[PDB]
């Protein structure tokens, strides 16, 4: 990893007391995608600082992709000439937030539109008379379709009679039968 050679020296020299705070921040960044404060604290110019950030991210992104065990991560770290004291910080940080980090990447949808909010309300009409008209309730469904490309919700409204919502329920029960066949 001839490119890594530069980063291994830069990271080893970084202040170990400041190192866990930055790792947590990059993990927070990874579930999706201030510089001046880092430039002053770590004494690196913008282009130089970025190589460290890119290297840490690449390490974490590789670690998440393979779901590496703590012993497996340190086995790779010890082979690339990183000093153990930095490896101890990586392994500690990974051992705690690891599975939850992987789960978000395991949960993150590719497609643009994802259902975010589900809201129901029910609407009723009332018959004190002998027969004004024997008339049903009807439900309406709020779907919050997150266009995650934008983070703009389409709040979509669909209305059901009891005569319809039961048919829709049988389809959801069919989906559940399929989804339970995955066991």
């Amino acid at each position: 990893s001839p490119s890594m050679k530069k980063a291994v020296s830069l990271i080893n020299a970084i202040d170990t007391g400041r190192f866990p705070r930055l790792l947590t921040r990059i993990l927070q960044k990874l579930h999706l995608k201030e510089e001046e404060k880092l430039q002053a604290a770590f004494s690196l110019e913008k282009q130089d600082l970025h190589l460290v950030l890119e290297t840490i991210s690449f390490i974490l992104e590789q670690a998440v992709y393979h779901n590496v065990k703590p012993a497996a991560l340190q086995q790779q770290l010890e082979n690339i000439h990183l000093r153990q004291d930095k490896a101890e910080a990586f392994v500690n940080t990974w051992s705690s937030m690891g599975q939850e980090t992987v789960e978000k990447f395991r949960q993150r949808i590719l497609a643009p539109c994802k259902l975010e909010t589900v809201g129901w309300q029910l609407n009723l009409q009332m018959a004190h008379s002998a027969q004004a008209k024997l008339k049903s309730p009807q439900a309406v469904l709020q779907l919050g379709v997150n266009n995650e490309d934008s983070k703009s919700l389409e709040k979509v409204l669909v209305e059901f009679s009891h005569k319809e919502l039961f048919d829709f329920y049988n389809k959801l029960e069919t989906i559940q039968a399929q989804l339970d066949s995955l066991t």
Binding site: H66, R106, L115, V118, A127, E154, V158, H162, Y169, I175
Partner: protein, 75 residues
């Protein structure tokens, strides 16, 4: 306010992704077409599907109760 004209799905399990070698995490793809001629396609995580499925169960129970109470209202 539109009623559902058609409702359609497929149940998928994602085996691998650009950032995870072996995810095995399922999702339900939904497509609605509606009585106003609108249509929507969206992906529903399993947690959000259980919410939707449970919500429909409540609203069916209320509707069937209030419908039954109207027979008590004729009596």
């Amino acid at each position: 306010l539109p009623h559902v004209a058609d409702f359609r799905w497929r149940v998928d399990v994602a085996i691998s992704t650009s950032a995870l070698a072996r995810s095995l995490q399922p999702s339900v793809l939904m497509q609605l077409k509606l009585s106003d001629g609108s249509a929507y396609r969206f992906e529903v995580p399993t947690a959000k599907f259980q919410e939707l499925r449970y919500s429909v169960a409540l609203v069916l129970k209320e509707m069937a109760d209030l419908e039954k109470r109207c027979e008590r209202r004729l009596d």
